[PDB]
Ligand SMILES: Cc1cc2nc3c(=O)[nH]c(=O)nc-3n(C[C@H](O)[C@H](O)[C@H](O)COP(=O)(O)OP(=O)(O)OC[C@H]3O[C@@H](n4cnc5c(N)ncnc54)[C@H](O)[C@@H]3O)c2cc1C
């Protein structure tokens with residue numbers, strides 16, 4: 001019974017939005033309108049058709065991490081007897097950026113193919129904004145007195161506008177770059193300062209390190225004690241050391257007070273401890289907050305709260321019953337396959353009839369550091385609060401192939417966290433090469449409620465780094481009533 | 490009640506033997522004697538303390554596969570903008586062999602540390618042989634009229650002498666090398682012929698290819714149709730193509746009739762189709778048979794059969810109740826972590842009191858080809874015989890990073906085999922980089938009896954090759970009553 005122009009309007013053609021949009025349009029034959037600000041990546045808006053992940057997140061970030069490993073792998077080759085010229089070896093950053101752009105640009109092109117070819121699914125380039133719970137407006141600019149391009153009469157609204165990097169707010173904030181501007185840099189920087197301790201800081205530390213032009217260096221500088229908060233505490237310490245030996249100088253309890261410009265265009269940076277220093281480029285990876293701040297949410301009566309977060313029930317529904325919100329705008333788990341799920345399960349809830357919420361517990365996570373981390377489930381810290389008796393299994397070995405390659409800093413590390421009672425696996429925490437591949441399969445096991453029994457009853461694959469999961473039988477130590485004990489009562 | 494000199498005599502200090510030996514000695518305080526032919530690796534006996542795996546199998550083989558990838562990874566680097574000299578690039582094979590020997594030799598040294606330091610555990614260098622069910626003899630040579638070094642009065646005997654490469658038996662057999670002689674080659678061969686279609690042929694094809702000195706080439710030559718029998722049929726076809734594009738010429742329905750020597754020391758090789766050709770070195774990887782053929786088994790009354798195989802019940806026990814046999818000598822699954830388990834469960838059976846057999850079904854396997862294979866559980870061929878209704882899920886994608894690297898032949902491939910009835914996962918079959926790491930975790934899931942439900946209910950790790958396990962929902966096709974059908978009745 002056609003009353004409105006569109007069944008669904010989606011603010012943001014991101015990981016969350018596109019999954020919701022596409023499903024609604026092809027599997028339930030709804031008429032869908034998807035709003036985004038631009039159709040291909042790049043400044044000054046960065047995000048585009050495909051979302052943060054495709055244009056300025058996971059996909060480019062990984063392409064450039066893969067680049068920066070070639071440094072560590074061309075060093076490693078010498079031991080296996082690859083003689084070749086190690087004077088004529090610095091990486092050309094322009095060839096990396098050009099290649100990365102060709103790729104992201106191909107994905108943006110393959111999405112316009114999707115819209116023109118898919119029926120009932122339209123793309124509306126501009127700036128989303130609510131008037132009431134059934135009308136979405138598209139402007140030229142986010143300035144609310146801009147020319148209005150379209151008025152989208154609709155039944156349901158899905159807010160999936162994602163998040164945006166937080167600024168430092170000090171004298172000199174406007175001289176620093178972000179995850180956004182890092183991707184379209186013209187030159188790889190000789191002297192680089194990565195402020196922050198989050199996964200993005202550490203991934204980008206490894207890139208700029210890999211692509212430093214000759215006599216260059218990278219300083220990571222984090223305002224706390226130990227990088228990567230709410231990761232396993234021995235994995236963080238082991239990475240902090242391994243970044244050290246790949247060339248990255250890590251500093252802690254350290255915060256920029258001030259950045260002035262310089263003569264040759266470098267950045268003078270004043271710190272906590274008094275210290276000043278010059279860096280070519282300075283990058284802020286200090287958390288990412290929701291983009292609610294220009295959607296005129298207050299106008300159509302949807303609940304805001306912690307940093308603009310769209311306040312939502314388990315089934316992704318806002319304080320207005322026809323308006324829903326998914327992905328980073330909601331501020332739950334800020335990963336791409338989470339948003340995809342939340343959006344897939346929004347379509348099943350609303351249009352599909354088959355109502356479902358998203359599972360947020362024991363989701364497998366990965367850091368594309370050098371070396372990388374895989375993690376799934378809980379730290380031993382938050383285990384020993386929520387569980388009576390906790391076993392901690394732990395194992396750290398160095399692949400023999402590193403006794404050849406020279407890379408003897410590269411410790412591979414596994415930790416398993418247990419409920420003593422029934423032996424259930426609560427957490428798994430890996431560091432070292434191939435950890436992101438291995439954890440994906442572990443994430444399946446912990447969904448089926450795997451016990452430590454099930455790991456060490458499994459015949460191994462020899463020789464592998466993963467075969468050390470099934471050789472962990474004795475707990476290293478325990479927690480009873482959340483206090484660390486040598487051995488169990 | 491001490492009646493005999495030793496509780497346990499172990500023929501062969503291999504993967505199986507050492508696990509049995511060590512456990513018996515430290516966890517059950519038995520007096521153990523371990524017999525092997527030499528203490529460090531190398532010709533003319535090759536195997537030594539640590540077994541085939543440590544000296545001339547898995548461990549060296551992987552070190553040298555890791556070497557040969559540096560070829561494909563230095564090519565790949567150029568696209569990510571690693572300018573460097575690609576004239577001055579051939580691999581030095583002597584630096585690889587020297588480095589490999591330093592490693593294997595360190596492991597042999599770390600095992601003599603284990604014997605001198607561990608109590609009740611002695612090492613007896615020579616050639617094992619039964620006199621009766623309670624006496625083992627050690628000779629200088631395998632020639633049964635050799636000088637006798639020791640007479641080991643014992644209660645239990647464990648036969649774990651492993652296996653040995655099969656010869657071709659044609660005019661010219663004694664000119665060809667094997668897995669054994671390949672490891673101690675002086676020069677990497679310009680023109681290499683790998684006869685065979687088994688995992689060892691294909692791993693070693695990739696090595697000799699990686700380390701060919703300049704204008705050199707490798708021919709794989711298999712007497713059948715499609716290499717790697719009893720692997721998934723689309724994975725075999727995909728590898729056959731990818732070996733092709735890494736440089737390896739594969740020939741099929743082809744068997745050497747004759748090898749004569751040559752003038753400059755190369756090998757003239759006559760084939761089925763008439764064809765002759767000269768190769769520097771020619772390697773036989775055409776199956777590996779048990780080493781029973783010199784243990785005087787018939788003398789002490791233990792059951793032989795299929796190619797010398799020691800005929801054994803589920804708990805590893807021979808036709809004589811005090812004699813047991815594990816690992817490749819038994820001719821079950823010829824992998825190292827299998828033998829380790831069979832030996833660990835021999836010690837639990839006999840000395841431990843807690844009797845247990847080894848689980849052989851759904852053991853995860855891996856080929857260190859370039860690119861590598863991970864496999865666990867059954868082919869779709871042997872599924873559709875033993876199961877009424879079978880679903881086959883299948884997915885083949887190319888990581889975007891190969892649109893940069895130039896390696897566009899590198900297809901990553903997953904196949905899942907299902908029981909239609911209950912959705913149980915019977916088999917998993919992967920090809921492409923990191924497949925051996927991923928399958929280890931899958932092997933755990935299929936031990937817990939994982940359904941296809943459990944895979945695609947799991948939030949992904951983005952971006953990963955493994956995340957394509959959890960995005961497989963629609964079966965590609967089915968088998969009902971073991972006949973391939975487009976769609977299900
Ligand atoms: C450097 C980096 C690396 C990352 N790496 C990973 C990783 O490895 N794995 C992982 O799982 N996640 C990763 N993430 C996170 C991932 O990118 C996000 O979690 C994911 O994109 C969230 O999906 P979404 O749809 O909620 O947001 P988005 O994909 O950001 O969707 C928001 C879209 O809406 C548009 N938009 C914003 N405001 C408006 C408006 N007013 N009108 C119209 N359109 C608008 C934006 O332009 C954008 O296209 C990374 C993020 C970054 C920054």
Ligand SMILES: Cc1cc2nc3c(=O)[nH]c(=O)nc-3n(C[C@H](O)[C@H](O)[C@H](O)COP(=O)(O)OP(=O)(O)OC[C@H]3O[C@@H](n4cnc5c(N)ncnc54)[C@H](O)[C@@H]3O)c2cc1C
Nearest residue numbers: 501503504505536540541546547617650651816817823825
């Ligand atoms: C090239 C190659 C690659 C391989 N790769 C892998 C792999 O990646 N993964 C995997 O799981 N498996 C692999 N294998 C198989 C693995 O090496 C064997 O399955 C494993 O070693 C079997 O253990 P075992 O104890 O039965 O035999 P072994 O380890 O061979 O033990 C036999 C030992 O007994 C000794 N011996 C023999 N006769 C006598 C005698 N009369 N008296 C005394 N001692 C004697 C031998 O010298 C040897 O030390 C590979 C094999 C080869 C050849």
Ligand SMILES: C[n+]1nn(-c2ccc(-c3nc(CCc4ccccc4)cs3)c(OCCC3CCNCC3)c2)cc1CCCCN
Nearest residue numbers: 018019022023026103106107110111113114117118119889
């Ligand atoms: C006509 N037509 N075009 N397309 C169509 C066309 C395209 C895509 C994609 N392209 C990329 C770019 C990846 C890349 C490939 C090669 C090189 C670089 C990048 C991602 S996804 C697509 O997405 C289906 C899954 C979805 C998509 C939305 N997210 C959810 C999943 C559907 C499909 C149809 C048939 C539909 C009939 C209409 N009723």
Ligand SMILES: C[n+]1nn(-c2ccc(-c3nc(CCc4ccccc4)cs3)c(OCCC3CCNCC3)c2)cc1CCCCN
Nearest residue numbers: 400507508511512515592595596599600602603606607608
């Ligand atoms: C005194 N002492 N020495 N050792 C002792 C000493 C050594 C080893 C090994 N060394 C390697 C070499 C690997 C390498 C390391 C570094 C560089 C290259 C190679 C493998 S394993 C060892 O194996 C314990 C598990 C077993 C072993 C048998 N297979 C089964 C598992 C026990 C141990 C003790 C205490 C025992 C007290 C005696 N009652």
